């Protein structure tokens, strides 16, 4: 009943307060930050620019890359007054963008679900990654991972007829043979930062304050490089998620 | 270290009746509370004991929930049910409807008779059960030599007749799948004529229901030959 | 010796919601300490109880965080919210924003009203909740027959109105997926006219916010039909 | 009986960093005894604390294990190291050599200076550490406003200067992978001129070494961009 919104808050009632009624509440857990975000969701896909026997090289094709950034937020070959520089590794973008004329598909990669619904300012967690084959041919593929901020080491094949990506002390994966088609695994919160920005970082990324405003540095879970004969759908999963400082969700269009 | 395993020849195989569970994809989901509900039951067997109607065929061959008798002693039997779940006059009783989903049975069948003729009417019937070996009875006299009971009309309207479970084997097949066709017959005869006064409907109707008796059980769940309602 | 194993039919299968973990490739990694942080929360449900703004449409059809009243008693209702998470005037409230990610709900909705007209202004309103069955109310008189509360202006600026959870089922679907369209209406009426003195803005604005009440819960996490902000 | 198993989607997959062992094919093999050995160590981190040489560039641009000073107060700084593992004058120190195999660091860097000019020579230096935010210092005066220490020549030949770990984040990236380029600078200035007597070499050389301080740590093992020695 009667109250005062001015003070920053109000009585949070149930039927029994103003009327001859009562609390109808039942136990229920499924609405918890952790449990809720703890399910798999696609953010993009990987397409090999080259064989399992050669030297790897950044490669784009119809918005598809042979390498991808592990973050919920939007990403893509770095943008430029003259167009996204496709000869390079993807980076975090500040907005979502149509692949072409019509809205879909998207040029950018990201967790659309998480974007349309991230009721919070900061978050953190571990990331469980799943890489599933889109094709039906006996697979021969190599996958390389690296933590946020690490050298891409996108150098030349040392050993002929073998995959350059496999040539590293970093965590790499080798998948090959009939029936062997999906890669699954989990990586640690590997960022230099204490917590990550769910949406926006109200500051410059460089000391000169001239560049990339709104994007926090190393605000991601590292990245993936692929090589071999198979393209794959890539999904992420929020492990032991934690969120802070509540904020507004993505706007929804009012009915005409 | 990894555990070494021997992969059995039967791998990747799916079992319609596999005694085990599978993977859960939507956990921690509460099942909408239904504590208010009544009428719940656990055993299909109970449905079996609820007496339901036997379908008795007419000359023009159409069915009735009963049979008729009158002021006479028909030289032949009034009705005759063949103790055999597969059997047709039961085609549509709960007993048979449940039984056709199981391979074998054991125990007593209970035949229930209800007299709906006028209060002023009287008379007596002879209900009998004849086991195989000497062929089905062709006369009250013969029937009278097997298992039987006399049913006397009066104040009490009905009568529960039990076809005893008399058999070589501990169990019996529920279906006419190939041909030993039956497990004996239940035959109903007039002992004395239905008698009454002037001003009374001369032809009385006797409701005929059937059900599984107390002893009774079913086993081995299976599928019936598929059918289509008329 | 190796352990013999039976490989289940569902092998090699991937489950988006699999209740289990996978292989760790960068172990013993410390998670950058964040003990300094404040503002943390665990349950999406709480966000639901924070009152946020209802979008009220104008003739030229554009939205306001509120509605207006004046020195009159409009024969019809001032505003009318349809108790239904899917419902549009809520399209953009935290309550609805969270709710669209879940399949079902239960409990009270709380409608918060804040009077922003001048201190010198007075008057009374009649806020009501009408359950289905007899159609939506078309007159204060009818509304008055359902669940209602009178809101009196005065020193205290606001009012919390609770739309009771009255329903056949323990739960209710959160979305207009096919058509039973609603769970009743919340209607706001003038009881007495806004009254005031000369020198005062004749048209007062009443802020309209909505939120999940105390009893309230959501369940079964799902995906909304995908959308694109205008 | 065989144990039923659910075969996970990720089968047959190989993990370069898999936290587990594999199959042993030549068991019970004794490892040639080496109990006589000395010089053993367990933590790469220790190598990090052993001071090694900084490579100081000459006009014709070639490197020296040191820098020179004389009877003057150069208006600008004598040398300037950029606190940044990736940084080049350290390119060849054990500290940097180890650090490039790890993604992040934390703690103090220790800069070691050794005066090799003649015993008869004197003078004082001002070593300073400047954190970012206001740009790198361009004058002793400015440097003097940040973290600093005065180094006085005398009987004792050397000096250990600690670049404090002052940072927004608990950790810092070890490599110039994209561009925030640095974490501040270490600058060396003359406070007073090197002074001395006739018959003494006017230009003294100061050995410059660097190493990880006590507080210091590294984490997340990785691979550097591959290289080829000249």
């Amino acid at each position: 009943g009667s109250d005062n919104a001015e003070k920053g808050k109000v009585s949070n009632d149930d039927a029994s307060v103003d009327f001859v009624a009562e609390p109808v509440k039942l136990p229920e857990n499924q609405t918890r930050v952790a449990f809720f975000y703890d399910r798999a969701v696609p953010i993009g896909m990987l397409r090999p620019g080259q064989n399992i026997e050669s030297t790897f090289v950044y490669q784009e094709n119809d918005l598809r890359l042979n390498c991808l950034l592990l973050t919920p937020l939007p990403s893509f070959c770095p943008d430029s007054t003259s167009g996204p520089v496709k000869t390079k590794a993807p980076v975090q973008w500040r907005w979502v963008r149509s692949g072409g004329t019509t809205n879909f598909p998207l040029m950018t990669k990201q967790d659309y679900a998480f974007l349309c619904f991230s009721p919070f300012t900061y978050y953190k967690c571990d990331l469980e990654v799943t890489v599933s084959a889109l094709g039906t041919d006996t697979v021969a593929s190599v996958l390389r991972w690296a933590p946020t901020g690490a050298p891409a080491d996108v150098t030349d094949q040392l050993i002929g007829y073998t995959p350059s990506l496999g040539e590293t002390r970093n965590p790499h994966m080798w998948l090959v043979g009939a029936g062997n088609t999906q890669i699954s695994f989990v990586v640690p919160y590997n960022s230099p930062l204490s917590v990550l920005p769910a949406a926006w970082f109200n500051g410059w990324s460089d000391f000169g304050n001239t560049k990339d405003f709104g994007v926090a540095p190393n605000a991601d879970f590292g990245r993936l490089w692929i090589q071999g004969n198979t393209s794959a759908s890539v999904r992420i999963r929020y492990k032991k998620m934690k969120v802070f400082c509540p904020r507004p969700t993505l706007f929804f269009p009012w009915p005409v | 270290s990894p555990i070494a395993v021997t992969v059995r020849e039967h791998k990747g195989c799916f079992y319609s009746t596999n005694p085990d569970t599978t993977v859960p994809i939507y956990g921690k989901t509460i099942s909408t509370p239904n504590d208010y509900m009544c009428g719940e039951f656990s055993d299909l067997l109970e449905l079996c004991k609820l007496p339901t109607f036997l379908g008795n065929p007419n000359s023009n061959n159409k069915r009735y929930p009963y049979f008729s008798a009158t002021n006479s002693v028909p030289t032949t039997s009034l009705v005759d049910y063949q103790v055999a779940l597969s059997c047709s006059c039961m085609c549509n009783s709960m007993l048979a409807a449940v039984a056709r989903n199981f391979n074998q049975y054991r125990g007593s069948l209970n035949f229930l008779f209800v007299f709906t003729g006028a209060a002023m009417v009287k008379g007596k019937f002879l209900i009998a059960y004849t086991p195989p070996g000497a062929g089905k009875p062709t006369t009250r006299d013969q029937a009278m030599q097997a298992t039987y009971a006399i049913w006397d009309l009066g104040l009490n309207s009905s009568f529960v007749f039990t076809a005893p479970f008399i058999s070589p084997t501990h169990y019996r097949q529920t279906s006419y799948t190939s041909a030993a066709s039956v497990d004996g017959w239940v035959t109903v005869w007039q002992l004395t004529p239905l008698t009454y006064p002037s001003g009374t409907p001369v032809n009385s109707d006797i409701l005929t229901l059937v059900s599984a008796g107390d002893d009774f059980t079913l086993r081995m769940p299976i599928s019936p030959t598929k059918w289509v309602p008329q | 010796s190796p352990i013999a194993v039976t490989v289940r039919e569902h092998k090699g299968c991937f489950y988006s919601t699999n209740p289990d973990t996978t292989v760790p490739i960068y172990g013993k990694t410390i998670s950058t300490p964040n003990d300094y942080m404040c503002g943390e929360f665990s349950d999406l449900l709480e966000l639901c109880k924070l009152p946020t703004f209802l979008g009220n449409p104008n003739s030229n059809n554009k939205r306001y965080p509120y509605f207006s009243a004046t020195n009159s008693v409009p024969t019809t209702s001032l505003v009318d919210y349809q108790v239904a998470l899917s419902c549009s005037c809520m399209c953009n409230s935290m309550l609805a924003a969270v709710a669209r990610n879940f399949n079902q709900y239960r409990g009270s909705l709380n409608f918060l009203f804040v009077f922003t007209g001048a201190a010198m202004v007075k008057g009374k309103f009649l806020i009501a909740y009408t359950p289905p069955g007899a159609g939506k109310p078309t007159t204060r008189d009818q509304a008055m027959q359902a669940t209602y509360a009178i809101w009196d202006l005065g020193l205290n600026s606001s009012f919390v109105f609770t739309a009771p959870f009255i329903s056949p089922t323990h739960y209710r679907q959160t979305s207009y997926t096919s058509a039973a369209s609603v769970d009743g209406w919340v209607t706001v009426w003038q009881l007495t006219p806004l009254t005031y003195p000369s020198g005062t803005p004749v048209n007062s604005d009443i802020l309209t916010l909505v939120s999940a009440g105390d009893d309230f819960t959501l369940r079964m996490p799902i995906s909304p039909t995908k959308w694109v902000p205008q | 009986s065989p144990i039923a198993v659910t075969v996970r989607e990720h089968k047959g997959c190989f993990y370069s960093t898999n936290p587990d062992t594999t199959v042993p094919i030549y068991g019970k093999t004794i490892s040639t005894p080496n109990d006589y050995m000395c010089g053993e160590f367990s933590d790469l981190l220790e190598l990090c604390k052993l001071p090694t040489f900084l490579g100081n560039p000459n006009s014709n641009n070639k490197r020296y294990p040191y820098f020179s000073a004389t009877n003057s107060v150069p208006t600008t700084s004598l040398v300037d190291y950029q606190v940044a593992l990736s940084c080049s004058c350290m390119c060849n120190s054990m500290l940097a050599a180890v650090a490039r195999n790890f993604n992040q660091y934390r703690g103090s860097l220790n800069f070691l200076f050794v005066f090799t000019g003649a015993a008869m020579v004197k003078g004082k230096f001002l070593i300073a550490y400047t954190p970012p935010g206001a740009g790198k210092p361009t004058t002793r005066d400015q440097a003097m406003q940040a973290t600093y220490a005065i180094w006085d020549l005398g009987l004792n030949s050397s000096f250990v200067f600690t670049a404090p770990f002052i940072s927004p984040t608990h950790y810092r990236q070890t490599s110039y992978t994209s561009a925030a380029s640095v974490d501040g600078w270490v600058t060396v200035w003359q406070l007073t001129p090197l002074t001395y007597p006739s018959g003494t070499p006017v230009n003294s050389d100061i050995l410059t070494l660097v190493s990880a301080g006590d507080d210091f740590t590294l984490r997340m093992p990785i691979s550097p961009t591959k290289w080829v020695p000249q």
Partner: peptide
């Protein structure tokens, strides 16, 4: 009660393996 005859029958927690039974009142 049902058609399940496996001893090691847990692996997945109960509450995940089955809908949770709860009484309104």
């Amino acid at each position: 009660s049902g058609n399940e005859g496996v001893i090691i029958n847990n692996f997945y927690s109960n509450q995940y393996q089955n809908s949770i039974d709860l009484s309104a009142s």
